[PDB]
Design a protein around this ligand. Structure first.
Ligand SMILES: [Cl-]
Lengths: 215, 215
């Protein structure tokens, strides 16, 4: 029992379930008519136009049933397919694409027992990854929105809650008009891409994309 | 022309072309009968049992033709499919899987001109990503080989050659004996997974795996 999963009940209004309330949703994407994923701009860090790609659920299962558990190869594969799709939006913006599947902020370690715990009271462990663009940090690749982040060549720090020492970067909160501009362009570039021959030839029918209408 | 690609000829004996020489090759995997990828243990950093998954070439193109250029969605998608497969090796070993597609060590920036340069003299830009495992750093998840890396919850630093400030984490070179054990186990776990029922269900005929034997 070296790796353990937290057993815990999260409120329906917890941000992990009510994921659109932050107002940053780009789309929902369904893989092989079964696995459902959300693509949102990161609500707490605008650097590199960061997105989070998150596995919601399979079929009609609850979002909760996909917390704090091992993920199947199909679930992982679907996340990675949605990631492959989203890389093309960064490419069409003229950016170098980077991405990471981490989960550090919902993982912990007890040195006394040697146990690695997956999930916390504040944050469920969800199958998800981060994606962002690199380029000139001062260039507005989307009009009115500087890319931000460190210059190419340097490590982009995604910011772990748990640190052993201070770092030389921090998250940058979204300006409201900039968030709206970035969101609109991500939606448009994705919608355009889904209409391309490249999309059809590579994904065929296996990915269905529904752009989120602002509420 | 804000993103530029290096025009440069690499030696045929350069480590990027002669990839097996470091002696860390796990397998070559072909996606959809066309796109060829290598999976190796990272020759310079054993922490987390890091692997590198690298795009070699398509059909009969040279390895060099896949340096210092944009990658197509098919090339990216194939990399991510091979990644999805390799996640199952880490899962089988009882590890938390993490992975990153970065490229920082082959990307540079000139602030005076605003130009991002892809590829360098010392290192071509290749389509590739890093994967590793998290857990108790002192536990030998593979007998004879402690996992190493920082405790779960902390950020794993993959090391960028270029840094604005000194960091505390550093790469740990492979011990000869440990490398043999880790490699053997990665090959074994991959072999056990490949063509098992779960692999056939998910990947069907999509992925062809050739496990490498030392000669
Ligand atoms: Cl300046």
């Amino acid at each position: 029992g070296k790796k353990e999963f937290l057993k815990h009940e999260y409120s329906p209004g917890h941000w992990s379930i009510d994921y659109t309330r932050a107002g940053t949703s780009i789309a929902v994407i369904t893989v092989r008519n079964k696995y459902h994923y959300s693509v949102i701009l990161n609500p707490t860090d605008c650097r590199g136009y960061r997105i989070i790609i998150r596995y919601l659920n399979e079929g009609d299962s609850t979002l909760s049933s996909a917390f704090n558990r091992p993920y199947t190869v199909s679930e992982q594969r679907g996340l990675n397919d949605v990631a492959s799709l989203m890389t093309q939006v960064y490419e069409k913006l003229g950016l170098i694409v980077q991405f990471s599947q981490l989960g550090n902020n919902s993982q912990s370690f007890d040195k006394g027992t040697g146990v690695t715990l997956i999930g916390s009271e504040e944050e469920p462990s969800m199958l998800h990854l981060h994606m962002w663009g690199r380029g000139d940090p001062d260039m507005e690749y989307i009009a009115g929105v500087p890319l931000r982040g460190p210059e190419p060549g340097l490590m982009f720090d995604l910011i772990a809650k748990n640190k052993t020492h201070p770092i030389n970067q921090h998250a940058i909160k979204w300006n409201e008009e900039e968030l709206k501009a970035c969101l609109a362009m991500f939606k448009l570039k994705l919608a355009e891409y889904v209409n391309s021959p490249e999309f059809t030839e590579e994904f065929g029918d296996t990915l269905k994309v529904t752009i989120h209408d602002k509420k």
